[PDB]
Amino acid sequence: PMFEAAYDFPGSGSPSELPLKKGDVIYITREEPSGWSLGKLLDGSKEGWVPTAYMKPH
């Protein structure tokens, strides 16, 4: 399903993370027991880890 970022997430921890601005709608495919979710931009141009807690239903 699709989810929208509720908070900015610069994603500076690693290159495997997906930077988001508040307002960005993305696909989420998996939510992990680490507290991280795997997201993908709607145009398929990038994917990466985002904090599950930042993402609200869209």
Swiss-Prot record:
It comes from the Eukaryota. Phosphorylation probably activates the myosin-I ATPase activity. It is found in: Cytoplasm, Cytoskeleton, Actin patch. Residues 1-58 form the SH3 domain. One of two redundant type-I myosins implicated in the organization of the actin cytoskeleton. Required for proper actin cytoskeleton polarization and for the internalization step in endocytosis. At the cell cortex, assembles in patch-like structures together with proteins from the actin-polymerizing machinery and promotes actin assembly. Functions redundantly with LAS17 as actin nucleation-promoting factor (NPF) for the Arp2/3 complex. Motor domain phosphorylation by PAK kinases CLA4 and STE20 promotes CDC42-regulated actin assembly. The myosin motor domain displays actin-stimulated ATPase activity and generates a mechanochemical force. Interacts (via myosin motor domain) with SHE4; this interaction is important for proper localization and may regulate the interaction of the motor domain with actin. Interacts (via SH3 domain) with VRP1; this interaction is required for localization to sites of polarized growth and may regulate the interaction of the tail domain with actin. Interacts (via SH3 domain) with PAN1; this interaction is important for late stages of endocytopsis. Interacts (via SH3 domain) with BBC1 and LAS17. Interacts (via C-terminal acidic tail) with ARC19 and ARC40; ARC19 and ARC40 are Arp2/3 complex subunits. Belongs to the TRAFAC class myosin-kinesin ATPase superfamily. Myosin family. Present with 2280 molecules/cell in log phase SD medium. This is Myosin-5. The gene is MYO5. The chain holds residues 1088 to 1145 of 1219 of the full protein.
